[PDB]
Amino acid sequence: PAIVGDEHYRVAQEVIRILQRYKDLQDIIAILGIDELSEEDKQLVNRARRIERFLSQNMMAAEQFTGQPGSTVPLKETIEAFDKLTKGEFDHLPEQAFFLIGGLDDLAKKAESL
Amino acid sequence: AINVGVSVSRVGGAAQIKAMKEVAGSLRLDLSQYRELEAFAAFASDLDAASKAQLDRGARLVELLKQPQYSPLAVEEQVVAIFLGTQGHLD
Amino acid sequence: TLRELRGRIRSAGSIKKITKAQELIATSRIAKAQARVEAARPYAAEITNMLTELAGASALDHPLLVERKQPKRAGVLVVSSDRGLCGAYNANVLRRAEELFSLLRDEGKDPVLYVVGRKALGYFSFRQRTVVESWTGFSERPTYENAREIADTLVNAFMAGLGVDELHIVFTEFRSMLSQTAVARRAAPMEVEYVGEYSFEPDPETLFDALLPRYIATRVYAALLEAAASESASRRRAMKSATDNADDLIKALTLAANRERQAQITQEISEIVGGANAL
Numbered sequence: 057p058a059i060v061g062d063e064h065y066r067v068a069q070e071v072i073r074i075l076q077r078y079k080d081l082q083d084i085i086a087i088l089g090i091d092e093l094s095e096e097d098k099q100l101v102n103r104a105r106r107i108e109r110f111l112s113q114n115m116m117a118a119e120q121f122t123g124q125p126g127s128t129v130p131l132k133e134t135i136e137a138f139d140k141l142t143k144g145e146f147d148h149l150p151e152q153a154f155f156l157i158g159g160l161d162d163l164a165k166k167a168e169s170l
Numbered sequence: 171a172i173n174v175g176v177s178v179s180r181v182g183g184a185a186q187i188k189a190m191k192e193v194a195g196s197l198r199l200d201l202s203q204y205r206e207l208e209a210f211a212a213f214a215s216d217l218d219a220a221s222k223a224q225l226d227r228g229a230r231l232v233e234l235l236k237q238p239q240y241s242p243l244a245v246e247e248q249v250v251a252i253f254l255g256t257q258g259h260l261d
Numbered sequence: 262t263l264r265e266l267r268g269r270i271r272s273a274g275s276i277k278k279i280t281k282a283q284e285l286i287a288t289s290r291i292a293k294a295q296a297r298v299e300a301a302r303p304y305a306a307e308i309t310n311m312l313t314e315l316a317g318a319s320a321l322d323h324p325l326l327v328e329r330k331q332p333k334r335a336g337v338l339v340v341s342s343d344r345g346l347c348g349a350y351n352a353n354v355l356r357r358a359e360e361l362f363s364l365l366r367d368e369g370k371d372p373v374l375y376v377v378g379r380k381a382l383g384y385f386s387f388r389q390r391t392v393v394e395s396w397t398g399f400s401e402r403p404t405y406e407n408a409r410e411i412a413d414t415l416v417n418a419f420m421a422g423l424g425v426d427e428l429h430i431v432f433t434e435f436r437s438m439l440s441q442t443a444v445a446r447r448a449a450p451m452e453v454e455y456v457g458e459y460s461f462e463p464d465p466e467t468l469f470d471a472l473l474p475r476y477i478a479t480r481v482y483a484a485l486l487e488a489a490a491s492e493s494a495s496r497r498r499a500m501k502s503a504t505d506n507a508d509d510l511i512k513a514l515t516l517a518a519n520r521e522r523q524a525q526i527t528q529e530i531s532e533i534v535g536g537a538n539a540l
Contacts, residue, residue: 095387216442
């Protein structure tokens with residue numbers, strides 16, 4: 057928090073806690089799927105799988121293979137996006153929307169097409 | 171028995187003729203999303219008419235890609251063979 | 262290290278036995294539940310024939326056949342399993358229940374909620390809405406003496422117009438062993454369907470008014486038997502899936518435990534021979 061500021065650090069710790077709780081549940085998920093879990097866990101796993109996918113990005117280097125253009129996002133838009141994902145403001149969108157996006161406006165534009 | 175998810179070319183579409191690059195260029199992702207949709211639908215209690223159409227196309231693309239031993243196809247025949255699948259004439 | 266992988270293989274080799282056992286048990290219980298559905302069907306077919314033949318002579322003016330002038334508050338029954346391991350069953354029910362609550366609030370009504378089964382009671386106690394009444398400890402084997410209490414409560418809540426202006430049920434229809442779905446339908450007020458073309462004791466209006474609550478009790482019973490046959494068929498599917506996931510896990514862990522056996526032996530031999538060659 058002294059080098060990056062609290063509004064960055066809190067988001068980065070909240071994302072890690074969610075992905076850790078999912079990586080602990082992976083032992084049960086592998087056998088019984090999602091549906092056995094308690095609601096305090098099933099809420100978390102349903103945003104963990106979205107955060108996990110939303111850490112993907114369409115890079116400028118990959119354009120020569122996928123044909124999709126590349127994307128850059130500023131730090132403030134990254135922090136505002138993962139703050140909204142961990143609070144839950146995108147929990148209703150399907151997992152398949154979140155792949156290879158870039159920023160929030162591109163998330164909206166893609167989610168509107170599905 | 172080509173695994174279409176794990177196989178890659180890191181040269182990619184720099185070396186693929188413009189006809190093949192146009193016709194086939196979607197097929198990889200269409201087969202990868204069919205493979206996960208088939209892994210889901212093996213246990214799906216009810217299915218939607220969009221997923222049921224995509225799943226049936228995927229199954230007919232997997233039947234399209236196989237070929238017998240010692241039968242090489244020229245590129246001018248490969249492109250037409252992939253055209254039948256990708257443009258939906260096998261539906 | 263090898264000991265952790267030998268532990269995880271011992272664990273998964275036990276789970277594979279327990280899930281293959283409950284796939285075979287659920288494969289028998291869907292036959293018991295279908296036998297009970299097909300045994301309950303003859304009563305409901307005859308009550309329908311009798312109710313239509315009474316409605317032909319009746320004025321059709323019973324409360325359950327007339328809509329309210331301005332409805333505000335609609336009753337809904339959700340039915341769900343008393344156990345776990347079902348897989349999608351409770352989620353499919355509860356997604357349809359929320360899809361229905363977002364229909365009712367889009368017409369302008371608000372739902373009041375009645376619950377069968379401990380799983381939906383756990384869901385609607387994590388999300389903060391009330392439950393008006395609930396019943397548990399029979400979704401694995403419903404008996405008509407339970408459907409009676411559910412129908413009396415719902416019908417007494419409609420007839421009070423606290424009170425409700427409509428009645429709905431959310432449950433799963435067993436269509437076939439390989440396919441089933443959650444369904445939501447309006448139980449009251451009932452639609453009257455005229456179609457192209459007796460003594461009554463003491464009168465047709467009196468019997469019709471005393472028969473409709475007993476028809477509502479047999480319709481909620483038929484839905485509970487479809488819910489219990491469908492739960493067991495969803496359990497069978499989810500348990501076959503859990504057995505095949507455990508068989509792929511025992512395979513992957515064994516292919517890891519062998520690579521670690523071979524590395525351990527080769528490291529031990531490298532360490533022995535490096536010492537023997539130093540001398």
